[PDB]
Paper text:
The IsdG monomers consist of Fd-like α/β-sandwich folds forming a β-barrel at the dimeric interface containing the conserved Asn-Trp-His triad required for the catalytic activity in the heme binding pockets. Bc IsdG was crystallized in its apo-form and reconstituted with hemin, the latter yielding red-brownish crystals. In this study, we demonstrate that the reduction of IsdG and IsdG-dependent heme degradation can be catalyzed by FNR1, as seen from our spectroscopic investigations after the addition of enzyme to a reaction mixture containing IsdG and NADPH. The reaction between FNR1 and IsdG proceeds with a kcat of 2.6 ± 0.2 min−1, the KM of FNR1 for IsdG was determined to be 2.1 ± 0.4 μM, and the catalytic efficiency (kcat/KM) was 1.2 ± 0.2 μM−1min−1. The selected top hits with the shortest heme-Fe (IsdG) to FAD-N5 (FNR) distances cover a large potential binding area of FNR1. In contrast to our previous docking results for Fld to FNR1 and FNR2, it seems likely that IsdG can bind in the less exposed binding cleft found in the FNR1 structure, which is narrower than the more “open” conformation observed in the FNR2 structure, with the latter suggested to facilitate binding of Fld.
Bacillus cereus (Bc) encodes three FNR paralogs, two of which have assigned distinct biological functions in bacillithiol disulfide reduction and flavodoxin (Fld) reduction. In this study, we have assigned a function to FNR1, in which the His residue is replaced by a conserved Val, in the reduction of the heme-degrading monooxygenase IsdG, ultimately facilitating the release of iron in an important iron acquisition pathway. Mutational studies and bioinformatics analyses confirmed the importance of the conserved FAD-stacking residues on the respective reaction rates, proposing a division of FNRs into four functionally unique sequence similarity clusters likely related to the nature of this residue.
Author numbering:
A (entry chain A), B (entry chain B): 1 to 106
Write the structure that this text describes.
């Protein structure tokens, strides 16, 4: 299982703009091996906003299949390029090593 | 929903030691409002290992309850210190803004 994160440093007060663009049903959630997408807003960022888009996959080749897909070309098409309010964008890959679920389900 | 992360930079080749310490049933899983813990290893870090412990909570008050609990206190009773391979540690808090679950492509 892997997580892929896209972390955007954003001009203060503009984080909501990037959140809005992901706050809809899309195509990535129809991809094989997709396990979920979440958008996070970092707390206590003083002079900037920080928005993280993270997707979880059963394996890296499942993510790679999406990035080569047709739907990936449409979802990254009429996007107005990199907006003015994005100061930096970092992508990272993570291996999931341990998962510990609550007792309220176990 | 919030996520609390603790990200440790660790001497390259020693990341497995922190992961192993979290690879067991603990007490945070018994806390009300707890939604899950995972341990991540960042891919393609050159000079160090990076291990992230993530806990997910229904609300910030649930995490606060945990940090006030006798369990949390006992789990940090150690007055000794820190293993020499732990180089840095940063805590971050996140508000979950969007969750997109898998959908059938039909």
């Amino acid at each position: 299982m892997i997580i892929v994160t896209n972390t955007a440093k954003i001009t203060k007060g503009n984080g909501h703009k990037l959140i809005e663009r992901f706050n809809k049903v899309g195509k990535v959630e129809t991809m094989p091996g997709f396990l979920g997408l979440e958008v996070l807003l970092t707390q206590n960022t003083v002079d900037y906003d920080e928005v993280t888009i993270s997707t979880r996959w059963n394996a890296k080749e499942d993510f790679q299949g999406w990035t080569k897909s047709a739907a990936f070309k449409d979802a990254h098409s009429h996007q107005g390029g990199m907006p003015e309010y994005i100061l930096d964008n970092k992508i990272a890959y993570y291996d999931v090593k341990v998962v510990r679920m609550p007792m309220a389900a176990a």
